[PDB]
C-alpha cells in the first residue's frame, strides 16, 4: 500500500532502533526513508532563518537497512557551523513534543538532528565535526543530514545526503561518498581534516497517494503564481553584491590561484591544489541560474500577462 510505509510500527521502528547494526557494520544504514517534514521546515526555516545557523532534534525511525527522517528543520538560532555540539540544545523541542506526540498516537521517539545553515547548508562544520564525530560515537545511528538552503534556492533540486560519518576507528570503505563542498574559511581546513570521514544514505522519500494528489492540486492553482515571479524584482540590487561578491567569488579562484611557488605541488599547504576556481564555479553557476530565475520569471510573465490573447 502507498500508506504501508507511513505506517510507523513503533514496535518495528524502535526494534531496529535498538538493533545496533552499525556496531556490527557502520555501513549498514544505506537508505534514508524520509517523510517530507525534513524538506518542510528544513527548507523554509533555513530560508526563514536568513543566515542564522540552527540545530536540534529530528523525528524519525529505522526500517530494514534504512535511517528514516520523519522530521528535519531549523531553529531561529545561530552558532551552528561553529558550535561545540550545537544540535543538542534544541532537543528540548522533542524533549517535550514527541512525548505528548505519543498522546495522539505519535508513539515515535527522537531520532536525529534538525538544523539549517541558512544560505550555506545544513551540516556540521569543523567544531560541528567535533559535534558530528563525537555524537556518532555518542548517538549512533547519527547522520549528517546535508542540504543547502540557498543552494536549493538557486539549484532547483534537493541535494539530500544522510551522512553517517565514519566513526573514529571506522574509515571510509568502498562506499564513502564524503560530499566535498565549498566551505567558508572558518571550516574548510577542518573539512580537509575530516572530508573523508562520512558516507551518505540512499535517501528515498515515502508518502501517500493523497500526498501526490495534494501536490498536483497545489500546482493546479500555483501556475498563476508561476507566471508572477516574479524573480527579477526580488533581487534588485541583491545581485550587485552577488556580482560584487561573484567576481570576488571569482577572485576566490584568484585567491587560490594567484603564486610563484614552483616546485612540485602544494608543497606547503593544501592549495593546496591550484585552488577555489571550483568555488567561483559554483558561484557563477548559482548566480547565472538566479539570473535565469529572474529573466524566465519576468519574461514568461510578459509571455502570459502582457500578451496572450483577447
Partner 1 sequence: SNLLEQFILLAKGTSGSALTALISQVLEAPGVYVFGELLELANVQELAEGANAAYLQLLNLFAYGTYPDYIANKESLPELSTAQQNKLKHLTIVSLASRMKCIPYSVLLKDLEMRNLRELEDLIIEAVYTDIIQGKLDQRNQLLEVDFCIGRDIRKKDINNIVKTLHEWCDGCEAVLLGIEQQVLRANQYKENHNRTQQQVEAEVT
Partner 2 sequence: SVMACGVTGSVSVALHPLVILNISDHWIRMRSQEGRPVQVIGALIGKQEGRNIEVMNSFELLSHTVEEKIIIDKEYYYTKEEQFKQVFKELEFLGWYTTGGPPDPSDIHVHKQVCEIIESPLFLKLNPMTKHTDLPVSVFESVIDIINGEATMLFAELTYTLATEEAERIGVDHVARMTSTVAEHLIAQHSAIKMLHSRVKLILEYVKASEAGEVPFNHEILREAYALCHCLPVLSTDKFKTDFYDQCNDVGLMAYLGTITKTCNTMNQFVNKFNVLYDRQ
Site for partner 2 in 200-229 (CB under 8 A): 205, 207-208, 210-229
Q: Which of 104, 185, 263, 264 binds partner 2 (CB under 8 A)?
A: 104
> Is 128 labelled a binding residue?
yes
> Is 3 labelled a binding residue?
no
CA gap 56, 92 in Å, rounded: 8
Distance of closest approach, residue 56 Cβ to Zn ion, in angstroms: 13
Nearer to partner 1, 78 or 179 (CB): 179
CA gap 42, 106 in Å, rounded: 20
Nearer to partner 2, 195 or 277 (CB): 277
DSSP 2-59: GGGTT---HHHHHHHHTT--TTT-TT---EEEE-THHHHHHHHHHHTTTT--B--PEE
Distance of closest approach, residue 117 Cβ to Zn ion, in angstroms: 12
Other C-beta atoms closer than 10 Å to the C-beta of 4 total 8
Q: Which residues bind partner 1 (CB under 8 A)?
A: 227, 296, 299-300, 302-305, 307-310
250 binds, among Zn ion, partner 1, partner 2, none (CB under 5 to 8 A by kind): partner 2
DSSP 73-93: B--S---TTTSTT-GGGGTHH
Place of cell 538560532: 77
Distance of closest approach, residue 227 Cβ to partner 1, in angstroms: 6
Query: Do residues 178 and 195 touch, judged by C-beta distance below 8 A?
Result: yes
* Interface stretch with partner 2, choices 14-22, 169-177, 179-187, 292-300 (CB under 8 A): 292-300
Q: Which residues bind Zn ion (CB under 5 A)?
A: 83, 127-128, 131
Interface with partner 2 (CB under 8 A), residue total 102
Place of cell 560530499: 179
Nearer to partner 2, 193 or 299 (CB): 299
Nearer to partner 1, 138 or 223 (CB): 223
CA gap 27, 173 in Å, rounded: 8
Q: Which of 12, 230, 251, 272 binds partner 2 (CB under 8 A)?
A: 230
- β-bridge partners, 197: none
Q: Which of 19, 50, 51, 96 binds partner 2 (CB under 8 A)?
A: 96
Q: Which of 87, 131, 178, 297 binds partner 2 (CB under 8 A)?
A: 297
b/e 47-80 (16+ beta carbons within 10 angstroms → b): bebeebbbbbbbbbbbbeebbbbbbbbbbebbbb
DSSP 140-155: SS--EEE--TTTTTTT
Nearer to partner 2, 37 or 195 (CB): 37
Any contact of residue 134 with partner 2 (CB under 8 A)?
no
> Is 269 labelled a binding residue?
no
Distance of closest approach, residue 223 Cβ to partner 1, in angstroms: 8
Q: Which of 88, 134, 153, 195 binds partner 2 (CB under 8 A)?
A: 153
CA gap 69, 31 in Å, rounded: 10
CA gap 110, 125 in Å, rounded: 23
**Binding-site sequence positions:** 115, 117, 128
Residues making up the binding site for Zn(2+)? 115, 117, 128
Amino acid at each position: 500500500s502507498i500508506d504501508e510505509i507511513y505506517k510507523y510500527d513503533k514496535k518495528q521502528q524502535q526494534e531496529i532502533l535498538a538493533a545496533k547494526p552499525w556496531t556490527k557494520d557502520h555501513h549498514y544504514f544505506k537508505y534514508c526513508k524520509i517523510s517530507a517534514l525534513a524538506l518542510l521546515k528544513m527548507v523554509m526555516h533555513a530560508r526563514s532563518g536568513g543566515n542564522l545557523e540552527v540545530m536540534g532534534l529530528m523525528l524519525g525511525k529505522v526500517d530494514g537497512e534504512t535511517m528514516i527522517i520523519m522530521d528535519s528543520f531549523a531553529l531561529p538560532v545561530e552558532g551552528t557551523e561553529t558550535r561545540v555540539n550545537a544540535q543538542a540544545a534544541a532537543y528540548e523541542y522533542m524533549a517535550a513534543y514527541i512525548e505528548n506526540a505519543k498522546q495522539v498516537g505519535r508513539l515515535e521517539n527522537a531520532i536525529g538532528w534538525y538544523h539549517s545553515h541558512p544560505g550555506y547548508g545544513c551540516w556540521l562544520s569543523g567544531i560541528d565535526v567535533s559535534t558530528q564525530m563525537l555524537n556518532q560515537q555518542f548517538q549512533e545511528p547519527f547522520v549528517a543530514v546535508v542540504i543547502d538552503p540557498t543552494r536549493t534556492i538557486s539549484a532547483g533540486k534537493v541535494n539530500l545526503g544522510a551522512f553517517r560519518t565514519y566513526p573514529k576507528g571506522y574509515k571510509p570503505p568502498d562506499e564513502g561518498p564524503s560530499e566535498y563542498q565549498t566551505i567558508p574559511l572558518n571550516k574548510i581546513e577542518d573539512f580537509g581534516v575530516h572530508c573523508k570521514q562520512y558516507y551518505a544514505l540512499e535517501v528515498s522519500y515515502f508518502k501517500s497517494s493523497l500526498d501526490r494528489k495534494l501536490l498536483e492540486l497545489l500546482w493546479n492553482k500555483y501556475w498563476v503564481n508561476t507566471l508572477s515571479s516574479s524573480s527579477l524584482l526580488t533581487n534588485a540590487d541583491y545581485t550587485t553584491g552577488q556580482v560584487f561578491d561573484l567576481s570576488e567569488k571569482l577572485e576566490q579562484s584568484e585567491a587560490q590561484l594567484g603564486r610563484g611557488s614552483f616546485m612540485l605541488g602544494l608543497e606547503t599547504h593544501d592549495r593546496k591544489s591550484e585552488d577555489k576556481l571550483a568555488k567561483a564555479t559554483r558561484d557563477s553557476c548559482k548566480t547565472t541560474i538566479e539570473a535565469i530565475h529572474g529573466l524566465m520569471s519576468q519574461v514568461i510573465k510578459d509571455k502570459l500577462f502582457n500578451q496572450i490573447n483577447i
